[PDB]
């Protein structure tokens, strides 16, 4: 179980249980749905018939008038003050088992290898914090739509990437499931691998 380094020509030995295991479609699906649910601002409401403004005088009697019986001008059948089952702010987040999350990360990462979307290098950094500098480098590597994961939260690299829409930078500690999927290619430093490896183990 060896992932070939792009240019240094120094293959890197990784755990086959992490990077070499089978794709679990049902499991990965469940973790991606919960992350998106976990990102909601569950922020909404409507007014119940109790919260519509107005008074609770009977608009007109239980009997004798030719009209349909009424009780409240805020009845939800009535124009104005409807909303039979009004919304509250709510929490859309879901639980994920520690193990189901880690299991899921490993399956996706193992597929990345198999589809040649994972790219390993000895080093990945930039000189001055100029997005243009990075842009030149990325063209040279023949990369465009890409996620960058580095060994430490490198700042120059971090600053240079912010205005590049097809590029994101991440330290190993801050990774998440949907980013690893949402880009065409994914770049990891040698150091980045060792940190991701220990984390999933």
């Amino acid at each position: 179980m060896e992932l070939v380094l792009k240019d240094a020509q120094s293959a890197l030995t990784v755990s086959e249980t992490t990077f070499g295991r089978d794709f679990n479609e049902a499991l990965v699906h469940q973790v991606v749905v919960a992350y998106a649910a976990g990102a909601r601002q569950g922020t909404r409401a409507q007014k119940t018939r109790a919260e519509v403004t107005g008074s609770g005088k009977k608009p007109w009697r239980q009997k004798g008038t030719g009209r349909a019986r009424s009780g409240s001008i805020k009845s939800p059948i009535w124009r104005s003050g409807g909303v039979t089952f009004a919304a509250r702010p709510q929490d859309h987040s879901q639980k994920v088992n520690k193990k189901m999350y880690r299991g899921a990360l490993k399956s996706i990462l193992s597929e990345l290898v198999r589809q040649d979307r994972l790219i390993v290098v000895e080093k990945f950094s930039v000189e001055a914090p100029k997005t243009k500098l990075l842009a030149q480098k990325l063209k040279d590597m023949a990369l465009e739509d890409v996620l960058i994961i580095t060994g430490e939260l490198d700042e120059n690299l971090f600053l240079a990437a912010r205005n590049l829409h097809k590029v994101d930078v991440r330290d190993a500690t801050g990774i998440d499931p949907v980013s690893l999927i949402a880009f065409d290619k994914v770049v990891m430093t040698a150091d980045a691998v060792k940190q991701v490896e220990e984390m999933l183990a």
């Binding site: 007109w60 009697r61 004798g64 008038t65």
Partner: peptide, 26 residues
């Protein structure tokens, strides 16, 4: 303009009973 809107209208409601006339009557 020719505003065309004199009426409120605010249409009036009569109530309640003028006539209660029978009969069945029991």
């Amino acid at each position: 303009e020719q505003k065309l809107i004199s009426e409120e209208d605010l249409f009036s409601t009569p109530v309640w009973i003028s006539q209660a006339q029978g009969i069945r009557a029991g």
